[PDB]
Write a protein that binds this ligand. Structure first.
Ligand SMILES: [K+]
Ligand SMILES: [K+]
Ligand SMILES: [K+]
Ligand SMILES: [K+]
Ligand SMILES: [Zn+2]
Ligand SMILES: [Zn+2]
Ligand SMILES: [Zn+2]
Ligand SMILES: [Zn+2]
Lengths: 211, 211, 211, 211
């Protein structure tokens, strides 16, 4: 697939929509404010819309390398503050995936250039849960770090002033930590679901305990 | 659609893949390095995979509010450096969309909170092309700013040290500036396609001239 | 001067304070909240305390390359929000200096590495005021860009949600744009002093007009 | 001291330099590339030039809240890459101070606004060394966290691709971790001095062991 193939496929796909689903854009034209924010990885192995079946206009999406919510990443923070304060999304979903190239690159630690600084945040998590990973077989360490990474980004998101203020105001915002593999595409709930400051700390320790 | 509906739909979708497309994950398991990087908006009105027909594993995706490539956004820069130096993508596509909430919020300029700082970069572009927008009817100003925004992010991307170094090394990397509307989902090529430092400056002025 | 010389000089300087100024730290121990925030360049050719005579504890200081206030630099924005909302500084001073290495590196544009991305914000200003610099002799272009850079960072600071909210609340916060040279160390007021949203836009055009 | 007092003091100070030290700017005009980079706190309780006696032109300075070197702070990283690759500084000094308002605000954790996100990096350190602080008296916990913060920023700086590449190339660059108090202004060497990748990890554990 070259560039010309993508452009030509888009034109043919747009024209065939008149027969298949002429109302494909009606919910978009009606300004359907999305109820979900998806924070995923730039790998995008299986698209979030394909995993969940969410139709166009229902999903706000941010994607960075290894789905991180850094404390001081104004890029991701701006997406969250916009989705929470303006769009008023009711659910935020952070979703990693097993075999993530960013998580793996943080462990193997090769000289990849500028991205290594970004990956240092994963190694902080990989260092933080060193005692937890030791009680586990070696073959399961990398997939668990992928889950631990999601749990920590959920933790970081809930600790941000954006979520602290929204929960203080009383907004119904729920944070979710998910993961999937390319062996079945089955979403796994890491069970760190947070609705307020108390459930955030409660379910974080619950997710760490289940591992 | 609640949270339980997305989880249950994912399970049923994963099981039905055995009959519909049991090889749905074969290209993913074979570690297909993506040839395309998509820098789009977090609005994600129509997903990039739906617009272009790209199958899972073929598209590296970064999404922020109003598809920006800020000079000093290490989030977006890390995605680019990883896609260019490690994954060695052959095409980078920056794609806006008409009626973008971020572009519109920058023009109307309401008090939306933290996101207004992020949107100040659009107002810089909206200020930069003030004389160009004046020669146009009022009803076409906002859609053109959406196109100008894409052209400037392509300009910024090509000016980054990541792209300057890759083009200096001789890597075949091409930057594209696209836009689409939710009235047909038809991708429009803004014709600022850059393959090196010279075509970057050449096609930037060509895109500005066509407007 | 090696490392041992700095450590030994500090010890001797600390001991000699008992005779010279035993109350050197009394204002510091009394928790003197600083009334001034200084946003200067990392070059720090002449220290701000030496230029203004401000004693220890009176100056909050942020320094980056070429004294920038990028719209989305959470580092500088965090210093400002802390100084304005918590410390409640009454004056913010952005001060460049003629012959700044960062301003010069942006114009000459050498391959310096990661810093070139940071310097792209200066080239945006150098592009923005292209018509203004043309009406001037060549020998004065670089020093004027140093002044234009300060005026634009003052403009950016006043446009940030931190300053917009503080001025909306009624806080007495004043932004200043200064510059100095190493030929005399004399501070030059660029006359873009802003106390609210109206004087910000008014004095910005006044500073551009004086050039 | 108002604004007029600072401007007038600067003018009088500049004029009196002709009699006191007419060569005050000679080392500045001779383009003395600084050999030291100082990463300090924006509190700037005692200026670095006053602590060490470094004359103008000898010190490259970056200052943020609680002297942090975040993995993905392109502001601080740009200052470092410029000082190391372009200026080729031979020493980088990270210096905290006891009673730092940022360190204290991270522990007490009040609702201060945007700065709380920046301070979450300190709470990560305060969480990381929880077992170390427990073996110590309560009255010494906060001053030790100030030291631990410096040791971790030195650790982060040495882990950045900027320092990893400079040490790989063979550049003589040394990282130092210092701290001082406003009770005497005496600089304390935290003894985490790093000259390469090996001494970085060695002296980090040595500094943690001394506590
Ligand atoms: K993914
Ligand atoms: K979109
Ligand atoms: K300076
Ligand atoms: K300090
Ligand atoms: Zn991934
Ligand atoms: Zn949009
Ligand atoms: Zn400078
Ligand atoms: Zn401090």
């Amino acid at each position: 697939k070259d560039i010309d193939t993508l452009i030509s496929n888009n034109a043919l796909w747009s024209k065939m929509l008149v027969e298949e689903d002429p109302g494909f854009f009606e919910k978009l034209a009606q300004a359907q404010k999305p109820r979900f924010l998806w924070i995923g990885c730039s790998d995008s192995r299986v698209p979030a819309e394909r995993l969940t079946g969410l139709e166009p206009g229902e999903l706000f999406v941010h994607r960075n390398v290894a789905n991180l919510v850094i404390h001081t990443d104004l890029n991701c923070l701006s997406v969250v503050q916009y989705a929470v304060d303006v769009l008023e999304v009711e659910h935020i979903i952070i979703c990693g995936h097993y075999g993530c190239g960013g998580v793996q690159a943080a462990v193997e630690n090769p000289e990849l250039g500028l991205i290594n600084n970004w990956l240092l945040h994963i190694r902080d998590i990989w260092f933080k849960h060193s005692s937890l990973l030791g009680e586990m077989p070696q073959e399961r360490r990398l997939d668990t770090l992928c889950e631990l990474n999601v749990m920590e980004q959920v933790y970081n998101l809930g600790h941000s002033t954006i979520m602290q203020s929204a929960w203080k105001r009383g907004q119904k915002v729920t944070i979710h930590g998910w993961a999937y593999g390319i062996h079945d595409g089955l979403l796994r709930d890491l069970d760190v679901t947070a609705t307020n400051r108390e459930t955030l700390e409660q379910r974080y320790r619950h997710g760490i305990s289940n591992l």
